[model samples]
Target chain A: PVYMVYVSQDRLTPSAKHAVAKAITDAHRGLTGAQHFLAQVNFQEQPAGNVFLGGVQQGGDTIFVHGLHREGRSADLKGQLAQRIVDDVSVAAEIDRKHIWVYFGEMPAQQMVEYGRFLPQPGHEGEWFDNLSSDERAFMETNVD
Target chain B: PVYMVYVSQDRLTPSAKHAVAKAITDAHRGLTGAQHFLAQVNFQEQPAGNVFLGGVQQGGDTIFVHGLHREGRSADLKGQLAQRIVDDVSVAAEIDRKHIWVYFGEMPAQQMVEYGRFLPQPGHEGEWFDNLSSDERAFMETNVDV
Candidate 1:
């Protein structure tokens, strides 16, 4: 489950990309108690003319943030996840809050495999982490830091 | 509603492309009773690059499929929809079952736009279909499934 961030090419600078990633990771960890190391942010730039809202070209400040997380989070947690990311992303991108759209979707944990094993349900990170091969464990322990 | 399929570059041949699209559209209509034209499947291809899992680069075998539809479905339908697409897409795309991931999420009808107008509420597509501009109706009649 990764966060796919789409921003208008004309408005999203390299620096803005970094800022948005930081803001998203903070929100995911702060709200869900997930480690920063477990977060993956992928940035894609949408051509200026390609984005639309209501079939009209979107404003230059538009950003669409969507992610796939393992199911089991409470309804409130999911709502707050989107809210936190949207607010933080607005500040990071210097865009009005109204222009930032955020959607976080969930999939059953058993259906997804990451790092070569079926993902454990929400809040079972420790059980999943300990079972990973020692080498894979080291990657998360040090590579992401 | 639309299905957006993201695949590695050149992973799906031209024939396979249509094959997968057909399979996906079929699954939607069979399981959900949606019209064939209503199930738009868009394929996006990219260089097999820059995927990370747990801070390690991921292989290019992964394909992500997401279906966005009006929110009102039962939990059971959502789960069944994902499984059906995953199973169908694997056979259609020739990718291993484990490498193909599907995420289906619902959105409010008011938030979506099709044919230059906000989408009508679910169960009201026919009424909205009548309100289409003459040109939009022509486009649908000739270019889309009858």
Candidate 2:
């Protein structure tokens, strides 16, 4: 899974970018409990006018956050996670909450390949979890519902 | 309601980016038939290291296209549209299809607001379509599976 936070270039200072990246990675880890997921946070900065909302041009303050991952979580969990992301970014970037738009693109576990291995493994998730260390298992029990 | 294509900066020539924008817009129109949809294409190009696939860094050749829209279509339709987008980009960019990854983000209708108006408003799309010209209606009829 990869979490991408896209903001207009020159909108966020270097410090702001780092803050947003850390916030986003923390938010994701808060929910997924997978440490490897933290390495996948990316801040994609683009030129102004490249992003649009409601068919209208977007200002530099706007940030569109997209997360791609396997589909299995309940809708309620997804909504909560999105809001958590928006909240963290708003505080860290010093931007209005309304300027952030978070969306998740869900794919089947089998369709996603990482390090040449199927992530979900088609009904073998238990075996996958079993391989994790006790520390990761504890975090997984708390974070992953 | 929006289709976003992310590519590495300097990877796509201006002409190549134009081809992709047209191809992606046409793909959405081919599936949804809303002329106004043309205005929603976004080409978000960033530095090479900004994008990753399978937890590994991706090069400029990698393309990730993601579409955000109201959810109502069948899974089959969504899958077909994604593939169509990939196929079109592959041909236009002269790149291998494997280099592209397409994904769709579905939002609830009420969550979307266009022109300060909520889309898919409580059974009002029929009325909305009724106001369009016959040409538009014909296109909608052919494209919209509903």
| Candidate with the greatest DockQ versus the true structure | 1
DockQ of each: 0.19, 0.14
Give the alpha carbon lDDT tens digit for every residue of A5-60 in model 2: 77888887766766776677677656765453323445687679888878998778
Q: What is candidate 2's TM-score against the reference?
A: 0.56
**Predicted candidate 1 versus true structure: per-residue lDDT over A32-94, tens digit per residue:** 876666666655566776788889986667788878898899999899988888889888889
What are the root-mean-square deviations of the candidates from the true structure over C-alphas? 6.2, 8.8
Q: What fraction of the true interface contacts does model 1 reproduce?
A: 0.14
* CAPRI quality of model 1: incorrect
Error of 2 at B58 (Å): 2.7
How many pairs collide in each candidate, listed in order?
A: 0, 2
Whole-model lDDT per candidate? 0.71, 0.67
Colliding residue pairs in candidate 2: B1-B68, B1-B69
Candidate 1: TM-score of chain A is: 0.91
What digit string (tens of lDDT, one per residue) describes model 2 on residues B8-36? 78877988877887788777667765554
